[PDB]
Design a protein around this motif. Structure first.
Motif, short mmCIF file in Angstrom:
data_model
loop_
_atom_site.label_atom_id
_atom_site.label_comp_id
_atom_site.label_asym_id
_atom_site.label_seq_id
_atom_site.Cartn_x
_atom_site.Cartn_y
_atom_site.Cartn_z
N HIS C 9 0.55 -1.30 -0.43
CA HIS C 9 0.00 -0.06 -0.28
C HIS C 9 0.99 0.87 -0.16
N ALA C 10 0.88 2.34 -1.41
CA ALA C 10 1.24 3.48 -1.32
C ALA C 10 1.15 4.32 0.32
N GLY C 11 2.67 4.07 0.85
CA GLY C 11 2.31 5.48 1.90
C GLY C 11 2.89 4.48 3.39
N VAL C 12 3.43 3.35 2.89
CA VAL C 12 3.38 2.12 4.26
C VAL C 12 4.68 1.33 4.41
N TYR C 13 5.04 1.44 5.25
CA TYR C 13 6.28 0.80 5.17
C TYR C 13 6.75 -0.46 6.23
N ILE C 14 8.24 -0.45 6.45
CA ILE C 14 8.27 -1.91 7.26
C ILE C 14 9.64 -1.18 7.50
N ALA C 15 10.04 -1.77 8.86
CA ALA C 15 11.35 -1.58 9.48
C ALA C 15 12.32 -2.81 9.88
N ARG C 16 12.95 -3.28 9.44
CA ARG C 16 13.34 -4.71 9.43
C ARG C 16 15.10 -3.86 10.33
N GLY C 17 14.93 -4.26 11.92
CA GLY C 17 16.19 -3.76 12.34
C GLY C 17 16.28 -4.57 13.77
N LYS C 18 17.07 -3.98 14.47
CA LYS C 18 17.25 -5.40 16.20
C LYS C 18 15.35 -5.70 16.22
N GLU C 19 14.33 -4.53 15.97
CA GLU C 19 12.96 -5.57 15.59
C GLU C 19 12.38 -4.57 14.90
N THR F 55 3.55 -13.92 -5.63
CA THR F 55 4.19 -14.99 -6.06
C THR F 55 3.93 -16.85 -4.82
N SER F 56 4.67 -17.84 -4.35
CA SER F 56 4.68 -18.64 -3.46
C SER F 56 5.26 -18.02 -1.96
N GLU F 57 5.53 -17.21 -2.46
CA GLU F 57 6.19 -16.58 -0.78
C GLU F 57 5.71 -15.80 -0.17
N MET F 58 5.38 -14.93 -1.43
CA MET F 58 4.35 -13.64 -0.67
C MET F 58 3.00 -13.78 -0.75
N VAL F 59 2.22 -14.98 -1.27
CA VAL F 59 1.33 -15.07 -0.92
C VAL F 59 1.06 -16.37 0.58
N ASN F 60 2.07 -16.77 0.99
CA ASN F 60 2.39 -17.82 1.87
C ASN F 60 2.17 -16.65 2.75
N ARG F 61 3.24 -16.18 3.07
CA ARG F 61 3.55 -15.24 3.89
C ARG F 61 2.49 -13.56 4.33
N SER F 62 1.89 -13.21 4.89
CA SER F 62 0.78 -12.52 4.40
C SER F 62 0.89 -10.86 4.88
N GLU F 63 1.75 -10.54 5.59
CA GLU F 63 1.72 -8.66 6.20
C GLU F 63 2.07 -7.91 4.84
N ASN F 64 3.08 -8.18 3.71
CA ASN F 64 2.96 -7.45 3.11
C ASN F 64 3.48 -8.64 1.28
N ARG F 65 2.45 -8.67 0.77
CA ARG F 65 1.73 -9.02 0.18
C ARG F 65 1.98 -8.06 -1.16
N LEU F 66 3.35 -8.31 -2.48
CA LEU F 66 3.46 -7.75 -3.01
C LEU F 66 3.67 -8.17 -4.30
N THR F 67 2.99 -6.83 -5.76
CA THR F 67 2.81 -7.26 -7.48
C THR F 67 4.03 -7.61 -7.77
N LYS F 68 3.86 -8.81 -8.40
CA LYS F 68 4.98 -8.69 -9.21
C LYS F 68 5.61 -6.66 -9.73
N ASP F 69 4.94 -6.87 -10.45
CA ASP F 69 5.40 -4.71 -10.84
C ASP F 69 6.04 -4.65 -9.51
N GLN F 70 5.79 -4.26 -8.60
CA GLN F 70 6.67 -3.88 -7.53
C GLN F 70 7.71 -4.47 -7.34
#
Lengths: 408, 121, 228, 36, 191, 143
Positions: C9-19, F55-70
């Motif tokens: 979603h355009a406008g939100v992000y995920i941080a991958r750090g210590k947490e 893709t397979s991983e992108m659909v199995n794991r939920s929180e951030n499911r990208l488009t192939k274009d992305q």
RNA sequence: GCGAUGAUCACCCAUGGGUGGGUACAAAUGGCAGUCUGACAAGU
């Protein structure tokens, strides 16, 4: 037929086919939500109501409730014939404009939501008509004013401004202190014995303003600043002083500094009086009970007046000495019992264990008073609850004091 | 006055006051506005009973904030002197807190009253 | 030390750090609006908490089409003290705008404070049942989201969307059976409300249960179409 | 001295110093092995 | 030969400028509680205080007001018109005339403080040229005063050896050469 | 050895630390995701991979499911044994706060019960066949 | 057309940038950091 619409900048009227409902049918059925249809029916009559925020808020409140004089001066010349039909959205406004004097026909919240929706859709296209700007920030301003009125913000009841005042007051005390110390030192090259004999910063600066050099002081009076003995003392020290001679450029600039000192002191007392007045306006019962200054300290310590209300009584009893509180809790000594209230008038009046007990009862009664003053949606601002709680706590105090200890 | 919004009727008041006395007897009840606020802060409260004719009403009206902030049911009852009887103390009480304890005999009662309070909310 | 990656979603992000964190951008630097911890990497970022915002929990659970794009207008029903509409205004950014609505007075004052801080959020302390009343101010929000706890959720959404929403618009509803029915099975409830929306011309697309972050809570997203 | 080496107590600045730390841990090791 | 005046004047210039900063920030804050986008438009804090002292309340805005606040520094950056419409349509909460008089008095106070700083700075410049003109003409009055303050007294500076004054590639070369010449100048001006 | 006030203080510190840790951490989502489709043929042919363009991983794991274009973690040291180890240390730290908090709560409860029993009552000592000691106080309004 | 009035003496990409450290000032709804007890007492 006419249609009325409400805009954050003005009141708009558009003429269209008298068969307005069938026109709306054509609109929605042909998807005529476009500039084509709105250029077909652009505008009939606009009025941008004046740029006075009070006028804005009152006019929109009238739009909510009744019909305005702005509405009258707009509807003076809507009609050409004796009978014209006007579309309006509000039902109450609809029957009100039915009863108004011109008596032309109107239609309430009919299927004409199509018209309202489309004319708002290309209201940006209507902006080139009368309002050549972006209404977004207009709407922000108007909404904030309206919300202010709806919640009924009295201009005086702003706790955050109170915290501003108290913090600024503390900072003024600190900085006036440091400036006065600096001036005392810089003048110390000229009259150290005075620097020692008098301690008041304001008195020191007013001395520098009145006298300039030691024997000039010997020949000048200082009665309205210092008592007789102190001014004769500075006379003797002026006779036997160990400072240099000072050029008038130096004296000019040190005198300007002392002038800054006295002006700051005058401002600080003035601002403290202001804080008194404002707290009396806001939370009169607490002020009546414990006192304006400690009330300010309490609100500042808690942050929001509301959170200070939420706090229970014991936290109000020991709201200040939290450091000793937690240290003693952890180390298994006995907790403090005064905190910030200790500077209250009544707890100062009490003595020892009576101080502790009056502190507890004052804490509870103040909690009650504080909650009432904070959450009273309507409040007399007299402080009557404060007076009654004060009467009770004074009776309690007298009871404790008359309660003697030694067996007579 | 809608400031004391949820005000129990006669029947619900009966069962409320009965469980209040039960908890006072098994000593699962904290009596008073201040101690009630303390339980509320500590999150140990099963629910809150308040009086409805306090002089004035705001002194305890502060509580619904914390109650419906932390999702703890609260309810008003007509008379503070009645509430004092129900609690079992010599003086009128205005607000009491029924605490939470798994090892209580009155478990099922408290849960019934709390159920009906939630329905009424 | 913290990697930032864009969410779908355009406008939100995920941080991958210590947490790991789920985060948005900020417009009031160095000022958290309700106490959440912010981070910077530099550019200021602010974390959501799914337990505190139903929108946050729904995003964390995964949604196909959330209709809040940055360059849009977003309407909020039920901004209780505004803790979530702050994040929504962050998502929108200065290009768009968010119209929040509240009725009860204390959250009204909180949201006035927050809307004094931020310009993208606009306050409507007016009652939500009367878009006729607060029709003065806002013009056709692009997408509508509701958190209202009242039983007539569908009714009030219908009035708001009919009077204001742009056609083919997005609508998102938070619904809780413990408040609507509280005695009948939650999926049966959700069937009842989706039927109500289909009656009121909202074509549903998705609904999610939020049960790891809130018990008995659903969020439905649908399109508003063929209307005026 | 420094700004970041300014510790509010002589014990914690003794901790902050490192050569002291390694000497102490060593000496403690062999004194413990002689005790045991 | 007395120079404790120079020491004190430096203490004042520094602390005074810090306090000017603090109180200008406070006035920014309060007149932002009344009308914040002005505080955003004009960052120059002294001009901000004078602008408050002119437009106490956001209500007063006309074309003569336009012209007079254009005389207030200028119009070339559209400050006049931009503040005019921003205040006509501001989202600023309104407050008491007591608050207005308080804020105006405070802005007046800060303005007087800044004028005092200017006067004191000219004082320092001419007193330096009085006391240690060679050191001044070498390095500059303000920096020479800072040196004298660091040392503790002109005598301590002059008694000080060259390398210690220094601690008091061609960058290093020139720095050290300057330190030597500075120490010589201090000797001359002290004795 | 210790006092009830200290025990109460320690438990409250642990509550606040635990809520801070929960605020900073998250839990993986597991929702009951239900899609609405129009026609039966579309439902029979539906596949999440195409409906979400993942893709397979992108659909199995939920929180951030990208488009192939992305579409059109190795920066840190030892990614496969150190970062996950820190993850688990944070988790077990949260759990350690939790269990120490509950032990403190039990201790505080027992201390309070003893203190009150010494405090007052017209008490009767009753023993329950599960071996558990209770005190029933007589029914008397406390003045 | 010299000098005691002072000569001389951490990493990466090719004298450009990045990493680090030092000093002053400022901000924080950042941290340390948790807001006492809860029914009898005073006279007779």
């Amino acid at each position: 037929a006419y249609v009325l619409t409400e805009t954050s900048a003005g009141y708009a009227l558009l003429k269209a086919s008298d068969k307005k409902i069938y026109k709306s049918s054509s609109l929605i059925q042909d998807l005529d939500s476009s500039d084509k249809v709105l250029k077909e029916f652009k505008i009939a009559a606009f009025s941008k109501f004046n740029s006075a925020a009070n006028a804005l808020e009152e006019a929109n409140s009238i739009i909510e409730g009744k019909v305005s004089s702005q509405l009258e001066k707009l509807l003076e010349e809507i009609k050409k014939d004796k009978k014209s039909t006007l579309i309006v959205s509000e039902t109450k406004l609809a029957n009100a404009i039915n009863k108004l004097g011109l008596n032309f026909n109107v239609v309430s919240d009919a299927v004409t939501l199509d018209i309202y929706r489309a004319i708002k859709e290309y209201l940006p296209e209507l902006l080139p008509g009368m309002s050549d700007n972006d209404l977004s920030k207009m709407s922000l301003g108007l909404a904030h004013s309206i919300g202010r009125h709806k919640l009924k913000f009295s201009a005086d009841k702003v706790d955050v401004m109170i915290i501003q005042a108290i913090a600024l007051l503390d900072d003024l005390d600190k900085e006036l202190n440091t400036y006065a110390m600096r001036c005392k030192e810089w003048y110390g090259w000229h009259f150290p014995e005075l620097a020692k004999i008098v301690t008041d910063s304001v008195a020191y600066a007013r001395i520098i303003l009145t006298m300039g050099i030691r024997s000039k002081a010997s020949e000048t009076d200082l009665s309205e600043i210092l008592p007789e003995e102190i001014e004769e003392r500075v006379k003797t020290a002026a006779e036997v002083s160990m400072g240099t001679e000072i050029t008038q450029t130096d004296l000019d600039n040190i005198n300007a500094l002392a002038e800054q000192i006295v002006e700051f002191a005058a401002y600080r007392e003035q601002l403290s009086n202001y804080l008194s007045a404002r707290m009396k306006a806001i939370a009169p019962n607490l002020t009546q009970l414990v006192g304006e200054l400690v009330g300010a300290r309490l609100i500042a310590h808690s942050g929001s007046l509301i959170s200070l209300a939420k706090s229970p009584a014991s936290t109000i009893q020991i709201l200040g000495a939290e450091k000793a509180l937690f240290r003693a809790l952890k180390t298994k000594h006995d907790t403090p019992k005064y905190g910030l209230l200790y500077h209250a008038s009544l707890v100062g009046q009490a003595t020892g264990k009576n101080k502790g007990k009056i502190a507890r009862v004052l804490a509870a009664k103040a909690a009650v008073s504080l909650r009432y003053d904070a959450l009273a949606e309507d409040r007399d601002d007299s402080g009557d609850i404060g007076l009654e709680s004060r009467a009770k706590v004074e009776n309690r105090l007298s009871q404790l004091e008359g309660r003697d200890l030694r067996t007579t | 006055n809608p400031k004391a919004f949820p005000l129990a009727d006669a029947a619900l008041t009966q069962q409320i006051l009965d469980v209040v006395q039960q908890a006072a007897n098994l000593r699962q009840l904290k009596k008073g506005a201040n101690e009630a606020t303390k339980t509320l802060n500590r999150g140990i409260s099963e629910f809150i009973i308040m009086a409805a004719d306090c002089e004035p009403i705001e002194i305890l009206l502060h509580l619904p904030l914390l109650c419906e902030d932390k999702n703890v049911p609260y309810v008003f009852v007509p008379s503070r002197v009645a509430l004092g009887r129900a609690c079992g103390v010599s003086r009128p009480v205005i607000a009491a807190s029924i605490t939470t304890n798994d090892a209580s005999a009155i478990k099922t009662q408290i849960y019934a009253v709390k159920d009906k309070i939630e329905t009424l909310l | 030390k913290v990697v930032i990656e864009p969410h779908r979603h355009a406008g939100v992000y995920i941080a991958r750090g210590k947490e790991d964190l789920l985060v948005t951008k900020n417009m009031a630097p160095g000022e958290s609006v309700y106490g959440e911890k912010r981070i910077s990497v530099k550019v200021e970022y602010r974390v959501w908490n799914p337990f505190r915002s139903k929108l946050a929990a729904g995003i964390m659970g995964g949604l196909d089409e959330l209709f809040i794009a940055p360059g849009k207008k977003v309407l909020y029903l039920g901004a209780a003290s505004g803790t979530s509409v702050s994040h929504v205004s962050d998502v929108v950014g200065p290009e768009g705008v968010v119209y929040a609505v509240e009725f009860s007075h204390r959250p009204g004052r909180e949201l006035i404070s927050m809307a004094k801080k931020r310009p993208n959020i606009i306050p409507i302390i007016e009652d939500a049942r009367h878009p006729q009343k607060y029709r003065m101010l806002i013009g056709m929000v692009d997408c509508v989201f509701a958190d209202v706890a009242q039983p007539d959720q569908a009714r009030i959404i219908a009035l708001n969307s009919h009077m204001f929403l742009k056609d083919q618009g997005g609508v998102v509803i938070s619904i809780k059976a413990n408040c609507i029915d509280s005695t009948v099975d939650a999926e049966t409830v959700f069937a009842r409300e989706v039927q109500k929306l289909r009656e009121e011309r909202i074509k549903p697309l998705e609904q999610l249960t939020l049960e790891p972050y809130e018990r008995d809570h659903c969020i439905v997203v649908g399109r508003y179409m063929r209307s005026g | 001295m420094n700004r970041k080496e300014r510790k509010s107590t002589i014990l914690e600045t003794l901790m902050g110093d490192e050569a002291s730390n390694k000497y102490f841990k060593r000496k403690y090791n062999e004194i413990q092995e002689k005790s045991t | 030969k007395n120079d404790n005046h120079i020491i004190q004047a430096i203490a004042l210039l520094d602390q005074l400028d810090k306090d000017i900063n603090t109180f200008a920030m406070r006035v920014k804050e309060w007149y932002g509680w009344h009308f914040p986008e002005l505080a955003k438009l004009v960052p120059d804090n002294y001009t901000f205080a004078k602008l408050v002292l002119f437009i106490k309340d956001k209500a007063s805005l006309n074309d003569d007001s336009l012209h007079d606040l254009a005389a207030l520094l200028n119009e070339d950056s559209g400050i006049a018109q931009r503040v005019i419409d921003n205040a006509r349509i501001s989202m600023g909460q309104d407050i008491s005339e007591t608050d207005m008089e308080n804020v105006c008095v405070f802005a007046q106070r800060v303005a007087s403080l800044a004028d005092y700083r200017r006067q004191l700075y000219d004082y320092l410049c001419e007193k330096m040229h009085t006391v240690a003109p060679n050191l001044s003409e070498l390095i500059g009055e303000v920096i020479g005063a800072r040196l004298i303050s660091h040392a503790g007294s002109l005598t301590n500076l002059s008694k000080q050896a060259a390398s210690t004054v220094q601690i008091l590639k061609n960058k290093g070369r020139i720095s050290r050469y300057l330190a030597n010449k500075c120490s010589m100048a201090s000797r001359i001006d002290n004795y | 050895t210790q006092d009830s006030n200290y025990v109460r203080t320690l438990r409250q510190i642990e509550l606040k630390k635990l809520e801070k840790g929960a605020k900073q951490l998250m839990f993986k989502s597991s929702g009951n995701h239900t899609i609405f489709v129009d026609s039966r043929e579309k439902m029979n042919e539906f596949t999440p991979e195409k409906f979400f363009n993942t893709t397979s991983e992108m659909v199995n794991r939920s929180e951030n499911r990208l488009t192939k274009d992305q579409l059109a973690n190795a920066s840190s040291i030892m990614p496969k044994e150190s970062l996950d180890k820190k993850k688990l240390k944070k988790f077990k730290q949260v759990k350690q706060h939790l269990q120490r908090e509950t032990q403190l709560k039990q201790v505080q409860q027992r201390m309070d019960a003893q203190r009150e029993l010494l405090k007052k009552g017209s008490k009767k000592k009753i023993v329950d066949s599960s071996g558990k000691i209770s005190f029933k106080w007589k029914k008397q309004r406390k003045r």
